[PDB]
Amino acid sequence: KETAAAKFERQHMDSSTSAASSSNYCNQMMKSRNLTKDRCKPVNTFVHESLADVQAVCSQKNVACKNGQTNCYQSYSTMSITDCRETGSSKYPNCAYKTTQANKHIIVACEGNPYVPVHFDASV
Secondary structure, eight states: OOHHHHHHHHHBBBBTTTSSSTTTTHHHHHHTTTSSSSSSOOOEEEEEEEEHHHGGGGEEEEEEETTTTTTTTOSSSEEEEEEEEOOOOOOHHHHHHHEEEEOOEEEEEEEETTTEEEEEEEEO
């Protein structure tokens, strides 16, 4: 099955654009990445940076993850990110999202060898 690393790429990496270009970014991306297949995933963040810059977070600032785990890392720099949040009108299978573009620090949980991001914790 899909690896945790690959799922991370699928769910959160958008190196093809440097920012969301229209309010429909979220609707399009959430659908195209298969995040609304089984249900409308309520929230999702996409990161507009190269994979190697995101992977590099795993060797940046170690912080506790929201749930208490100690394998989280916070990026030294801000990153271009797109926040996607389910709208009051969202109704499966027509999931609908609000797009919010921002430059923030990202926090990811890392695992394995190579030690890479497997989960998006938060943006600060």
